[PDB]
Amino acid sequence: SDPTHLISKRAAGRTSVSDKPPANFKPHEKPLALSYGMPNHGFFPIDSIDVNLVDYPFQKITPQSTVHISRHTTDPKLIDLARGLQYAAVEGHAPLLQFARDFIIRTHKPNYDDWNVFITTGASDGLNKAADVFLDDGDVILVEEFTFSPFLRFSDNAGAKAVPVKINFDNDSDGIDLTQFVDLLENWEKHYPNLPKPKALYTIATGQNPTGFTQSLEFRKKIYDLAVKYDFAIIEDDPYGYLTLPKYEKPNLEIDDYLKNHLTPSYLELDTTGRVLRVETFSKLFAPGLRLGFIVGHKEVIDAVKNYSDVVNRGASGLTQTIVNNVIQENFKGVDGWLEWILKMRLNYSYRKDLLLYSIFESQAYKKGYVDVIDPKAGMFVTFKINLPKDVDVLQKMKLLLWKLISYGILVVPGYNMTVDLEFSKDRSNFFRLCYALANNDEEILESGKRLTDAVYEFFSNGLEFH
Amino acid sequence: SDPTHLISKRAAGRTSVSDKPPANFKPHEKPLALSYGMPNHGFFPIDSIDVNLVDYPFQKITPQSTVHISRHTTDPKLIDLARGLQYAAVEGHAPLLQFARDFIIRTHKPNYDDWNVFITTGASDGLNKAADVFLDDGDVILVEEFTFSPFLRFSDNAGAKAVPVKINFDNDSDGIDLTQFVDLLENWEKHYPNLPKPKALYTIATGQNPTGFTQSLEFRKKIYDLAVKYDFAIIEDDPYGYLTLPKYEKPNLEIDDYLKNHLTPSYLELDTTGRVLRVETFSKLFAPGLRLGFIVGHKEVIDAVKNYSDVVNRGASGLTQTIVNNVIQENFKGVDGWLEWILKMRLNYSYRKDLLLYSIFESQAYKKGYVDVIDPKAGMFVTFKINLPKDVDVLQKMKLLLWKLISYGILVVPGYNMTVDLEFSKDRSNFFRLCYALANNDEEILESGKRLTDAVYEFFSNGLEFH
Ligand SMILES: *Cc1c(COP(=O)(O)O)cnc(C)c1O
Ligand SMILES: *Cc1c(COP(=O)(O)O)cnc(C)c1O
Ligand SMILES: N[C@@H](Cc1ccccc1)C(=O)O
Numbered sequence A, B: 001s002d003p004t005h006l007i008s009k010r011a012a013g014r015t016s017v018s019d020k021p022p023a024n025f026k027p028h029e030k031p032l033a034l035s036y037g038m039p040n041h042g043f044f045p046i047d048s049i050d051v052n053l054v055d056y057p058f059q060k061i062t063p064q065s066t067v068h069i070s071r072h073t074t075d076p077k078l079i080d081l082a083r084g085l086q087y088a089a090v091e092g093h094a095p096l097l098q099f100a101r102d103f104i105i106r107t108h109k110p111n112y113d114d115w116n117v118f119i120t121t122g123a124s125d126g127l128n129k130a131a132d133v134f135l136d137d138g139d140v141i142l143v144e145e146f147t148f149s150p151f152l153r154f155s156d157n158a159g160a161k162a163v164p165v166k167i168n169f170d171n172d173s174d175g176i177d178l179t180q181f182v183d184l185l186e187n188w189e190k191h192y193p194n195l196p197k198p199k200a201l202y203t204i205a206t207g208q209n210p211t212g213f214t215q216s217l218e219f220r221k222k223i224y225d226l227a228v229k230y231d232f233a234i235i236e237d238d239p240y241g242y243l244t245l246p247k248y249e250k251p252n253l254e255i256d257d258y259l260k261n262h263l264t265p266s267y268l269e270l271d272t273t274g275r276v277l278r279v280e281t282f283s284k285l286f287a288p289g290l291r292l293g294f295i296v297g298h299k300e301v302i303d304a305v306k307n308y309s310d311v312v313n314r315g316a317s318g319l320t321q322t323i324v325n326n327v328i329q330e331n332f333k334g335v336d337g338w339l340e341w342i343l344k345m346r347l348n349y350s351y352r353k354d355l356l357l358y359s360i361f362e363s364q365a366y367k368k369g370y371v372d373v374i375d376p377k378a379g380m381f382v383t384f385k386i387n388l389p390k391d392v393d394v395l396q397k398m399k400l401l402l403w404k405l406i407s408y409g410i411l412v413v414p415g416y417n418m419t420v421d422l423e424f425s426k427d428r429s430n431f432f433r434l435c436y437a438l439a440n441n442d443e444e445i446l447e448s449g450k451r452l453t454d455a456v457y458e459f460f461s462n463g464l465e466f467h
């Protein structure tokens, strides 16, 4: 079982990075190099780096935890500065590639053997790789109608067309409306008569950007079976699926439990043949300034993406791979230590969501029926629904209400900024995306949702004007 | 004038990342965010970093030089970890953009006002951006017949055809044979009747990879003048031009005197219109594993390069910008101090090149006339000529001698591995590139040239066979 068929003409056809030696030849057993254009490590200005950490989020400065990064190391699980600040295999340093093979064995084991990982400069990097590796010029990619907008620059670069896939906005939505999704495929010729059959599905199955929704283990089985039947690849994008949130309890967990009953399976777990490419990032779990991530796919998909990175992004920062790999191994003692740090963030992220939602639930705006809120199963985004009258112009009134938000002093992202096709999605655009991740503290969350709901109350009180 | 016309249709065509305020719309003064999917810095497992530096190349274990990176600082010459580990502008952090401008005003002041820098992930990343910003499908790029081979994949990715420009191998040589360069251009339709007029030149003008040649100031004026006449862009690649080398003396400097008299001027110093795009890297001067560099070009070229980054390479590591920005500002006290560290390395690479040449000059292979070396004027590479009888097969006998080089225990790079077009350049392929950047010490240089000379002698003593 292999996905060679799914891999692009463009990506397949890029070349790999010299014969029978003479009869009486043996290599010399310790040779010297006049070959590669590499400054010897003695040239590097950095001798050692001390990385000073925290035991938990929001802690202010038991003594401080420290990882020392020395010029040289014998530990096969650490990266020294001698290799870390030197030229490296583009696919990544071996210790960080291994930490990720194990992390994925622990959290989302692929249902087949011939899989591999590949260090990236983040999710967006990972998506652009996934787009290049699966889309030729003229292909259609299936994109969730409200999506992570940048993806369309990577599909558009690979020359593909984003066909939009309707989201169900019910409080129990999996996200993607399975019925309108089955119809699109069954009746492709009827909907898009002048476009080829879709090549791929770009889905943010868990903590969907920006809707909030998570696809259940039974919904994924169905989508995967649609992937096998109509033979399309799955680009899975999971930057914060590890941040599982329990459903709203009014405000004011061990590794085996989380892994067994809190964390929703990844499409990697359903995949037998390598038609799933998974995109991961250290952005929302460590810091966004790393520009570090990894993808998981079939050995031959990762190979193609290697040849692409050889052209457009020749390696993640080795100093960053060094600082991040050694913090995860020395401080956090590997896979299970990193899940314990991921779980600390869970509680914080968990507490914040519930606060923003309480914030909203006490408002006259919620009580009067003007706004509702989807309860996100994971991540850092809430869908904030605006119950405008049906007959009014969604885009016109949402634009006018955005200026009202900005005048009351609450910035949000409107739904209509996150579409594949604004005409296709205008009627389901009556929503702002809230993110409770950036705030400094609990009082900001409270004040944030006070203003958001105060503004919406004036907007409606005023009869949907700025009066 | 300006180089708007030189910007590729493809690069020009990317979008740069909208309704009228209502009547009396005052924005709120101090507003809150539920907008961006940015974790608050409080979520970052790193609180501070100490970077432990050497003060001269090859030092061992004076209080030791160290730089403290705090979560917060008000110094506008520094980057804290609050900004540095957070989503950042794709062009780079303002302190590091500022150092690059200043570094460049000091060293290679462009000859016009309308230029800018941009943070890259090294020279290979710069050159890809350059290839993209200047070349459409079916465009032609002139490339030195022996070159940095990876460049071809960038040009190939841009849809462009690489025409080779001949190298003169005279010990005299500027590199590019200017006589055959002026011919190619004057009589283009006799040379390549199928192909458009060249869109650009790729030139490693100082310390040419691999040949080692440096173009004089007056030879660059001639190249620049051909560039205005035939209206092509110049992609100037300079990874080691700063490491100027005094001509050979038998072995065993003040900033203003280096700047004023040792450093060969950059095409930037000739450019009046924005024709020139300069590729800088921290690879060879600091460390390769940073994946950090920058480009100098016209404001309109760099905007284009920005929109391309937005697609394929969303910014250098912030953590790496942070460690490099601060090391250079705190420890080295800015531009003049960084040039003082560049001068320390200069002295090393200087002593190394001469030890290598001394080692070659004292051998029977040199003395018998079986080899010769070019005195390079900058960088970390040497053309080692192999005087093969004119009528033997250059490639056949060179692949043979390489096998002999490997059996005697010296790894070198054959020139025939660094061609645009192997058949076009076969007759000038009778040379290996030597690099003295990688050796741990002087002893490794002298033993390196000993093994190189022993084998060329033995191979020549055997009759240009292995034996
Ligand atoms: C935040 C986010 C990203 C950004 O990933 P980077 O590593 O920051 O490029 C990508 N995809 C989704 C769905 C996100 O929410
Ligand atoms: C080493 C080298 C490069 C590569 O730069 P990176 O920053 O390592 O990508 C590019 N051009 C030349 C001429 C080089 O010698
Ligand atoms: N500045 C970010 C933009 C971004 C913000 C938030 C989420 C994702 C992306 C970048 O260059 O990649």
Ligand SMILES: O=C(O)CCCC(=O)C(=O)O
Binding pocket: A036, A037, A038, A087, A088, A089, A090, A314, A315, B124, B150
């Ligand atoms: O490190 C890589 O993957 C590519 C760097 C290419 C290079 O300049 C070199 O070979 O030294």
